[PDB]
Design a protein around this ligand. Structure first.
Ligand SMILES: *[C]([C]C([N])=O)[C](C(=O)[N][C]([C][C][C][N]C([N])=[N])C([N])=O)N(*)(*)(*)C(*)(*)(=O(*)*)C(*)(*)([C@](*)(*)C(*)(*)(*)(O(*)*)[C@@](*)([N@](*)(*)C(*)(*)(*)(*)([C](*)*)=O(*)*)C(*)(*)(*)C1(*)(*)[C][C][C][C]C1(*)(*)*)C(*)(*)(*)(*)([C](*)*)[C](*)*
Lengths: 99, 99
């Protein structure tokens, strides 16, 4: 899918048996979703964004289906305002920037 | 160009006499540049991200050259960690997302 930037680029993901909409974010090094329930062990961690720093938990080797495409990596769960698909998973579904 | 996401999608911009580097950020609605010297009048504005809110100053109709292409748009100048080119300018240089 070629996506134009007039509208936010939101995509359906299936993550841990639940369905979500997530933003495709090339400025995000990582993937960060709003609080949810994931099975598994996680480790504390903090990321930096524009308004400061949040404390999140990482889970690694989480299967995620992004718009019908399957990917497996680390997902950060914490208090982001929106679900964010970063470049750690954008390079698994093969996604590039073109202009 | 075709920009692949293994590395931050970082681009050279020329804005106000000055050379800067900025990230192409599809998750940013707006363009937020590091605090710098700009001519004109602006208005207080506040924006949010991961971490929370920042107070930035907003400039309309500023000419930017992004990877050589020119566009005119609102540029927000304030306390952000990196320079971000966001959807308001990225649709102007014809940028798309592909997977
Ligand atoms: C940007 C800024 C502007 N303004 O544009 C941001 C945004 O867009 N914000 C907004 C909010 C709204 C939404 N809400 C709801 N949905 N609810 C405003 N208006 O303000 N964006 C953001 O933040 C994104 C992210 C980004 O991409 C970042 N990342 C992180 C990880 O944090 C980028 C970065 C920064 C620092 C340096 C590097 C890069 C998301 C969406 C949150």
């Amino acid at each position: 899918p070629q996506i134009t930037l007039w509208q936010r680029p939101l995509v359906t993901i299936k993550i841990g048996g639940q369905l979500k909409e997530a933003l495709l974010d090339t400025g995000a090094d990582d993937t960060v979703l709003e609080e949810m329930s994931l099975p598994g062990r996680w480790k504390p961690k903090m990321i930096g964004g524009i308004g400061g720093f949040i404390k999140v938990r990482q889970y690694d080797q989480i299967l995620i289906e992004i718009c019908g495409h399957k990917a497996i990596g680390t997902v950060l769960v914490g208090p982001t305002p929106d679900n964010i698909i970063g470049r750690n998973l954008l390079t698994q579904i093969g996604c590039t920037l073109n202009f």
